[PDB]
Amino acid sequence: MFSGVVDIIVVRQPDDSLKSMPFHIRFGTLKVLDNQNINIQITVNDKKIEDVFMLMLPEGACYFPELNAKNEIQKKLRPSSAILKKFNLKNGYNKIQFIAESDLQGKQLIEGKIYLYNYDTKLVISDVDGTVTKWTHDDIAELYTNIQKNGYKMVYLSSRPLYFYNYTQGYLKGIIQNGFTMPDGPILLSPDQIISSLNREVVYKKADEFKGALLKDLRRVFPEEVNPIFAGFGNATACLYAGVIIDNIFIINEQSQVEILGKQEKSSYKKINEKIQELFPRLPAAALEHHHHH
């Protein structure tokens, strides 16, 4: 029944090509009389994108048809670099709209967020439930704000059912703590919550493995030479194996006590923020860009 777009992440590669994570979109309130007559068009930052379209399976999952060498059509959740370049994305947040039309009248519109990162961007992962929520932990909005001000990008992770996705986005946007708000960033969704025929290879993972796979997939959109995930906040093997050093894995408990793994330091969001230059050292070029957009 979901209508919407799971936030999309696109990364520019050192050779100028673009790669993205999967496009997960649904038109849950559209009655589809015949899926083969559906075509989906794309508008980015209020500009229609020419010569790009998506198709829809009988089950409602949407994909990019792309010819392989055999002139066979492959059904792709991840569009080609050539297609992504037609979007004319800017660094950071971009508005994206998908419009499902048929041979008949009536067009279904959904709106999402698509983020563009350069390959040298440094990401800071945060769980939502239990890490942002306890009710919201104290001092988290000031810390995350100052992480973002030092040039890092907050990336949120959720494993709630798709039903709650737009609510989780509203929750994060509504936090305010002493004037501080949560930095805008993408919310990635555990893949077991958005299974279709297009990503069903997923189903041969055990339930415990989905976060780790998600973080490896996030890393894979970056080039082999870089290490993009700088730190992670949770409530650990998943961060470690996706390239987070153990000192940068922050695990909060019941009591709002934060354990800095591998230092076995017991700390807080307030105290991490006090030592922000030591733990999240300023990234000069990346910080300048954030400052001059905000």
Numbering used by the authors: 20 to 153, 168 to 268, 273 to 331
Excerpt from the publication:
Structure 1 was determined using a Δhelix-His construct that lacked the N-terminal helix but included a C-terminal His-tag. The Δhelix-His structure represented an inactive state due to covalent modification of Cys276 by cacodylate, which was present in the crystallization solution. Cacodylate modification of Cys276, which lies below the nucleophilic Asp of the DxDxT motif, induced a major rearrangement of active site loops and residues, including an Asn residue (N268) that binds Mg2+, the adjacent Arg residue (R269) we implicate in PA recognition below, and an Asp residue (D272) that is mutated to His or Asn in rhabdomyolysis, which formed a hydrogen bond with a Mg2+ bound water in other active states of catalysis. In sharp contrast, in the Δhelix-His structure (Structure 1), cap region 2 formed an upward facing alpha helix that was continuous with the prior helix and would be perpendicular to the membrane interface. This unique conformation was formed through crystal contacts, with the continuous alpha helix packing into the active site of an adjacent molecule. We thus consider this conformation of cap region 2 to be an artifact of crystallization and represent a catalytically incompetent state. However, it does highlight the flexibility of cap region 2, which may be important for the regulation of lipin/Pah PAP activity.
Lipin/Pah phosphatidic acid phosphatases (PAPs) are Mg2+-dependent enzymes that catalyze the dephosphorylation of phosphatidic acid (PA) to produce diacylglycerol. pmcLipin/Pah phosphatidic acid phosphatases (PAPs) are magnesium-dependent enzymes that are evolutionarily conserved from yeast to humans. They catalyze the penultimate step of triacylglycerol synthesis, through the conversion of phosphatidic acid (PA) to diacylglycerol (DAG). Structurally, all lipin/Pah PAPs contain highly conserved N-Lip and C-Lip regions that combine to form two domains: an immunoglobulin-like (Ig-like) domain and a HAD-like catalytic domain. The remainder of the C-Lip adopts a Rossmann-fold, forming the haloacid dehalogenase-like (HAD-like) domain and harbors a conserved catalytic motif DxDxT, where the first Asp coordinates a Mg2+ ion that increases its nucleophilicity, and the second Asp participates in acid/base catalysis.
